XYZ file of N, CA and C in Angstrom:
468
model
N -36.660 40.467 138.237
C -37.871 40.617 139.093
C -37.452 40.636 140.564
N -38.273 41.231 141.418
C -37.975 41.270 142.844
C -38.028 39.855 143.415
N -37.157 39.560 144.369
C -37.064 38.214 144.904
C -38.362 37.644 145.440
N -39.189 38.469 146.069
C -40.451 37.942 146.578
C -41.362 37.406 145.473
N -41.301 38.014 144.288
C -42.048 37.491 143.143
C -41.445 36.224 142.584
N -40.121 36.143 142.556
C -39.463 34.927 142.111
C -39.827 33.754 143.032
N -39.843 34.017 144.335
C -40.195 32.963 145.275
C -41.640 32.456 145.126
N -42.588 33.367 144.914
C -43.964 32.932 144.689
C -44.086 32.213 143.328
N -43.402 32.718 142.305
C -43.380 32.027 141.036
C -42.877 30.581 141.164
N -41.814 30.374 141.940
C -41.350 29.038 142.243
C -42.389 28.199 142.957
N -43.082 28.756 143.945
C -44.148 27.990 144.594
C -45.263 27.572 143.635
N -45.671 28.467 142.728
C -46.640 28.155 141.709
C -46.144 27.074 140.749
N -44.968 27.306 140.204
C -44.379 26.380 139.262
C -44.250 24.989 139.867
N -43.772 24.875 141.114
C -43.580 23.569 141.683
C -44.876 22.774 141.742
N -45.991 23.444 142.005
C -47.281 22.730 142.021
C -47.893 22.444 140.667
N -47.535 23.226 139.631
C -48.109 23.016 138.315
C -47.232 22.237 137.341
N -45.921 22.192 137.588
C -44.957 21.703 136.589
C -45.180 20.242 136.176
N -45.763 19.418 137.048
C -46.063 18.028 136.692
C -47.567 17.702 136.698
N -48.380 18.749 136.582
C -49.825 18.614 136.459
C -50.272 18.955 135.030
N -51.317 18.230 134.592
C -51.872 18.388 133.248
C -52.808 19.603 133.209
N -52.178 20.768 133.264
C -52.859 22.087 133.280
C -52.248 22.967 132.195
N -53.119 23.546 131.381
C -52.725 24.444 130.295
C -52.728 25.838 130.862
N -51.555 26.373 131.190
C -51.438 27.677 131.868
C -50.353 28.525 131.228
N -50.515 29.824 131.409
C -49.522 30.756 130.953
C -49.511 31.951 131.873
N -48.326 32.472 132.160
C -48.210 33.699 132.882
C -48.422 34.860 131.888
N -49.223 35.848 132.282
C -49.523 37.009 131.469
C -49.285 38.308 132.222
N -49.384 39.425 131.517
C -49.314 40.678 132.198
C -47.923 40.953 132.714
N -47.861 41.784 133.734
C -46.600 42.369 134.143
C -45.498 41.361 134.414
N -45.821 40.266 135.102
C -44.780 39.279 135.367
C -44.257 38.645 134.080
N -45.151 38.353 133.128
C -44.730 37.815 131.849
C -43.824 38.822 131.115
N -44.230 40.070 131.091
C -43.433 41.102 130.439
C -42.033 41.143 131.043
N -41.981 41.194 132.367
C -40.709 41.229 133.101
C -39.841 40.000 132.832
N -40.434 38.808 132.863
C -39.695 37.588 132.526
C -39.099 37.617 131.134
N -39.753 38.320 130.214
C -39.312 38.405 128.843
C -38.417 39.599 128.564
N -38.061 40.324 129.626
C -37.084 41.397 129.523
C -37.593 42.819 129.531
N -38.897 43.011 129.623
C -39.453 44.357 129.635
C -39.350 44.897 131.060
N -38.666 46.037 131.262
C -38.511 46.520 132.651
C -39.765 47.230 133.214
N -40.752 46.439 133.634
C -41.976 46.964 134.206
C -42.056 46.506 135.662
N -42.780 47.277 136.463
C -43.101 46.910 137.825
C -44.127 45.781 137.826
N -43.967 44.820 138.733
C -44.920 43.709 138.881
C -45.642 43.902 140.205
N -46.983 43.910 140.264
C -47.637 44.066 141.580
C -48.472 42.836 141.977
N -48.899 42.073 140.997
C -49.597 40.818 141.215
C -49.042 39.816 140.205
N -49.641 38.640 140.187
C -49.293 37.612 139.207
C -50.564 37.188 138.523
N -50.558 37.230 137.196
C -51.734 36.864 136.400
C -51.443 35.565 135.688
N -52.324 34.583 135.900
C -52.258 33.305 135.232
C -53.513 33.123 134.389
N -53.305 32.878 133.102
C -54.366 32.567 132.172
C -54.361 31.064 131.898
N -55.553 30.498 131.757
C -55.708 29.081 131.588
C -57.008 28.825 130.821
N -57.386 27.565 130.662
C -58.652 27.235 130.042
C -59.693 27.033 131.148
N -60.927 26.714 130.753
C -62.007 26.652 131.780
C -61.674 25.610 132.851
N -61.354 24.379 132.412
C -61.013 23.300 133.308
C -59.793 23.633 134.187
N -58.822 24.290 133.554
C -57.594 24.638 134.203
C -57.804 25.547 135.396
N -58.771 26.447 135.288
C -58.974 27.406 136.357
C -59.423 26.681 137.616
N -60.357 25.748 137.457
C -60.884 24.987 138.594
C -59.810 24.055 139.130
N -58.981 23.527 138.244
C -57.867 22.664 138.682
C -56.831 23.432 139.468
N -56.498 24.643 139.010
C -55.570 25.472 139.748
C -56.090 25.816 141.154
N -57.375 26.135 141.224
C -57.997 26.364 142.531
C -57.796 25.174 143.477
N -58.028 23.978 142.972
C -57.870 22.760 143.767
C -56.408 22.592 144.206
N -55.513 22.745 143.240
C -54.076 22.533 143.495
C -53.539 23.479 144.556
N -54.062 24.714 144.556
C -53.639 25.758 145.486
C -54.716 26.054 146.519
N -55.441 25.008 146.910
C -56.658 25.217 147.663
C -56.464 26.021 148.956
N -55.335 25.841 149.652
C -55.117 26.551 150.922
C -54.845 28.029 150.788
N -54.612 28.513 149.563
C -54.270 29.882 149.251
C -55.422 30.679 148.615
N -56.575 30.051 148.457
C -57.689 30.669 147.726
C -58.315 31.801 148.513
N -58.347 32.981 147.904
C -59.038 34.136 148.406
C -60.366 34.423 147.707
N -60.486 33.967 146.465
C -61.738 34.014 145.722
C -61.875 32.705 144.940
N -62.927 31.942 145.221
C -63.132 30.699 144.492
C -63.433 31.054 143.046
N -62.996 30.181 142.149
C -63.237 30.373 140.733
C -64.717 30.318 140.417
N -65.169 31.312 139.679
C -66.522 31.344 139.171
C -66.577 32.158 137.898
N -67.511 31.822 137.022
C -67.699 32.612 135.828
C -68.097 34.036 136.232
N -67.382 35.023 135.676
C -67.468 36.442 136.028
C -67.429 37.230 134.718
N -68.328 38.195 134.513
C -68.208 39.075 133.333
C -68.290 40.552 133.695
N -67.584 41.355 132.907
C -67.785 42.786 132.875
C -68.245 43.154 131.473
N -68.381 44.447 131.191
C -68.736 44.850 129.846
C -67.659 44.483 128.815
N -66.393 44.373 129.246
C -65.264 44.183 128.334
C -64.696 42.765 128.282
N -64.863 41.998 129.369
C -64.173 40.709 129.551
C -65.038 39.728 130.311
N -64.898 38.447 130.006
C -65.427 37.420 130.898
C -64.420 36.305 131.012
N -64.553 35.541 132.081
C -63.673 34.413 132.348
C -64.188 33.639 133.542
N -63.605 32.473 133.760
C -63.740 31.769 135.022
C -62.612 32.269 135.911
N -63.001 33.075 136.885
C -62.088 33.973 137.592
C -62.017 33.594 139.077
N -60.811 33.331 139.570
C -60.573 33.151 140.994
C -59.284 33.820 141.375
N -58.981 33.789 142.655
C -57.793 34.470 143.171
C -57.168 33.664 144.276
N -55.840 33.655 144.264
C -55.010 33.172 145.344
C -54.265 34.321 145.989
N -53.890 34.086 147.249
C -52.896 34.930 147.897
C -51.818 34.023 148.431
N -50.587 34.214 147.943
C -49.422 33.415 148.376
C -48.363 34.368 148.906
N -48.038 34.230 150.179
C -47.074 35.116 150.812
C -47.360 36.589 150.522
N -48.630 36.957 150.649
C -49.023 38.340 150.466
C -49.136 38.859 149.053
N -48.853 37.989 148.079
C -48.940 38.322 146.669
C -50.210 37.735 146.063
N -51.001 38.585 145.420
C -52.194 38.150 144.754
C -51.890 37.450 143.425
N -52.529 36.315 143.201
C -52.414 35.561 141.955
C -53.828 35.487 141.359
N -53.992 36.111 140.208
C -55.290 36.151 139.528
C -55.362 35.002 138.549
N -56.373 34.154 138.698
C -56.576 32.975 137.862
C -57.738 33.261 136.927
N -57.491 33.254 135.621
C -58.577 33.539 134.648
C -58.612 32.483 133.563
N -59.677 31.691 133.559
C -59.854 30.588 132.609
C -60.794 30.942 131.465
N -60.407 30.569 130.255
C -61.236 30.816 129.050
C -61.630 32.297 128.946
N -60.629 33.163 128.974
C -60.841 34.617 128.895
C -61.380 34.973 127.502
N -62.450 35.745 127.477
C -62.924 36.286 126.247
C -63.084 37.783 126.368
N -62.670 38.482 125.322
C -62.963 39.902 125.150
C -64.296 40.105 124.419
N -65.028 41.102 124.882
C -66.232 41.571 124.238
C -65.866 42.256 122.934
N -66.597 41.917 121.892
C -66.418 42.522 120.571
C -67.360 43.702 120.382
N -67.125 44.488 119.319
C -67.848 45.743 119.111
C -69.363 45.533 118.973
N -69.747 44.392 118.412
C -71.159 44.091 118.209
C -71.791 43.429 119.422
N -71.062 43.329 120.530
C -71.600 42.861 121.790
C -71.440 41.363 121.970
N -70.931 40.660 120.957
C -70.623 39.245 121.129
C -69.329 39.092 121.869
N -69.050 37.862 122.273
C -67.771 37.476 122.859
C -66.871 36.809 121.835
N -65.599 37.120 121.857
C -64.660 36.468 120.938
C -64.632 34.961 121.199
N -64.201 34.210 120.187
C -64.057 32.756 120.258
C -63.024 32.393 121.287
N -63.078 31.134 121.755
C -62.057 30.705 122.704
C -60.634 30.873 122.121
N -59.736 31.381 122.932
C -58.344 31.665 122.545
C -57.495 30.423 122.708
N -56.750 30.065 121.671
C -55.885 28.894 121.680
C -54.600 29.259 122.373
N -54.481 28.935 123.671
C -53.353 29.450 124.421
C -52.055 28.913 123.865
N -52.077 27.664 123.420
C -50.832 27.087 122.885
C -50.297 27.824 121.660
N -51.155 28.467 120.895
C -50.748 29.203 119.707
C -49.844 30.365 120.079
N -50.104 30.959 121.227
C -49.415 32.185 121.644
C -48.445 32.028 122.811
N -48.255 30.791 123.246
C -47.397 30.499 124.386
C -45.928 30.530 123.960
N -45.087 31.063 124.836
C -43.655 31.001 124.710
C -43.125 30.483 126.046
N -41.829 30.174 126.100
C -41.226 29.648 127.310
C -39.957 30.399 127.633
N -39.786 30.692 128.909
C -38.624 31.403 129.480
C -37.988 30.485 130.513
N -36.668 30.289 130.446
C -35.975 29.617 131.492
C -35.507 30.631 132.525
N -35.850 30.379 133.776
C -35.347 31.195 134.849
C -35.167 30.346 136.088
N -33.991 30.427 136.697
C -33.727 29.681 137.925
C -34.116 28.204 137.886
N -33.862 27.580 136.749
C -34.107 26.156 136.585
C -35.513 25.791 136.210
N -36.354 26.811 136.066
C -37.754 26.641 135.715
C -38.020 26.990 134.261
N -38.924 26.279 133.635
C -39.349 26.603 132.280
C -40.763 27.201 132.414
N -40.858 28.517 132.346
C -42.138 29.194 132.605
C -42.875 29.504 131.309
N -44.145 29.103 131.206
C -44.937 29.490 130.046
C -45.380 30.935 130.190
N -45.122 31.723 129.142
C -45.501 33.126 129.103
C -46.195 33.430 127.778
N -46.945 34.525 127.777
C -47.748 34.838 126.608
C -46.990 35.746 125.653
N -47.156 35.483 124.368
C -46.597 36.324 123.319
C -46.795 37.823 123.607
N -45.698 38.586 123.539
C -45.797 40.024 123.753
C -46.600 40.709 122.655
N -46.460 40.256 121.402
C -47.262 40.835 120.330
C -48.736 40.541 120.513
N -49.047 39.347 121.003
C -50.447 39.032 121.291
C -50.994 40.005 122.350
N -50.256 40.161 123.450
C -50.713 41.032 124.537
C -50.844 42.466 124.060
N -49.916 42.904 123.208
C -49.977 44.271 122.692
C -51.308 44.522 121.973
N -51.632 43.620 121.055
C -52.853 43.787 120.287
C -54.104 43.697 121.170
N -54.096 42.779 122.142
C -55.230 42.615 123.035
C -55.379 43.844 123.900
N -54.255 44.373 124.382
C -54.337 45.579 125.238
C -54.920 46.773 124.487
N -54.531 46.943 123.225
C -55.123 47.984 122.401
C -56.636 47.812 122.332
N -57.095 46.605 122.046
C -58.533 46.373 121.983
C -59.255 46.713 123.285
N -58.617 46.459 124.422
C -59.170 46.758 125.735
C -59.020 48.215 126.168
N -58.282 49.010 125.410
C -58.081 50.412 125.797
C -56.993 50.614 126.822
N -56.138 49.611 126.995
C -54.996 49.736 127.887
C -53.826 50.355 127.120
N -53.979 51.609 126.732
C -53.155 52.214 125.720
C -51.732 52.453 126.213
N -51.580 52.950 127.435
C -50.230 53.212 127.949
C -49.439 51.913 128.087
N -50.082 50.872 128.608
C -49.368 49.588 128.746
C -49.021 49.052 127.372
N -49.953 49.148 126.430
C -49.659 48.714 125.054
C -48.481 49.495 124.474
N -48.472 50.810 124.706
C -47.434 51.683 124.170
C -46.066 51.391 124.770
N -46.045 51.084 126.055
C -44.823 50.686 126.704
C -44.239 49.443 126.064
N -45.079 48.431 125.811
C -44.613 47.188 125.189
C -44.119 47.480 123.780
N -44.900 48.269 123.051
C -44.593 48.591 121.655
C -43.272 49.299 121.534
N -43.067 50.281 122.395
C -41.854 51.065 122.374
C -40.652 50.154 122.662
N -40.769 49.296 123.686
C -39.719 48.330 123.980
C -39.460 47.376 122.812
N -40.510 46.841 122.193
C -40.348 45.979 121.031
C -39.768 46.728 119.846
N -40.242 47.945 119.593
C -39.671 48.745 118.468
C -38.182 49.021 118.662
N -37.794 49.218 119.906
C -36.433 49.557 120.227
C -35.502 48.387 120.060
N -36.045 47.176 120.036
C -35.208 45.966 119.893
C -35.281 45.291 118.533
N -35.977 45.899 117.578
C -36.220 45.274 116.289
C -34.947 45.199 115.427
């Protein structure tokens, strides 16, 4: 990953590593940490409902959008944003995808799908690539899903 992302990741990790917060890095940074050669433009952190508000507090001086329940047609979450050294950090708590019948999926057990990567002395929680692949397909993020799939197929 580019050094500026590693540095912001360290700033995040240092504030969360000894706090009782259920968090995982997702999306491009998670893919990159796990070896997928993708460009990273922001940092996405997934957490539970309580976790989102706790992260806001912990990073209070960096908040660009206070956490609040937010929905679109496809997704809802407790959604806030940080900016750290010019890098956007998206905080999404209790993320649910909209189902075909218009209901929301059940709460996602983050611990079920969490993995850990050691980098630069840090143990970073990241989300299962197979989980993200399947979720991206459901959301219609087909090219990103295909990129992950192709990389995973190539390493099987």
